[PDB]
Amino acid sequence: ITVEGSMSEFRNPVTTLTGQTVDLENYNEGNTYFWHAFWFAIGVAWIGYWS
């Protein structure tokens, strides 16, 4: 099967029972990045303090 176009045009919408429509391509990505970066920064701060 041949597919033509670009990946940027792809959308994966979904509607939850809470009443909100979110795209699964980037849902929770920002929150995940923020939390992981915060915890990594905390660990780096600890190791730098002791280093």
Partner 1 sequence: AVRSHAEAVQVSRTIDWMALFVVFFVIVGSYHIHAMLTMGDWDFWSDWKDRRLWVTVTPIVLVTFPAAVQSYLWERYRLPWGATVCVLGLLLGEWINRYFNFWGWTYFPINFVFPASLVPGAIILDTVLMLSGSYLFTAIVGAMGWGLIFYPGNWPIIAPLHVPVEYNGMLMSIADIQGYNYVRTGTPEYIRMVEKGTLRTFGKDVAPVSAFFSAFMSILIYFMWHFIGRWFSNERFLQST
* Ramachandran angles phi, psi of 44, nearest 5°: -65, -40
Report the 10 Å Cβ neighbour count for 22: 14
One residue of 2, 15, 18, 26 binding a second copy per CB under 8 A: 18
Query: What are the helix and strand counts (H, E) for the chain?
Result: 1, 2
With respect to a second copy, which residue has the nearer C-beta, 7 or 17? Answer: 17
List contacts with a second copy (CB under 8 A). Answer: 17-19
Q: Which residues bind partner 1 (CB under 8 A)?
A: 7, 12, 14-18, 24-29, 31-33, 35-36, 39-40, 42-44, 46-47, 50-51
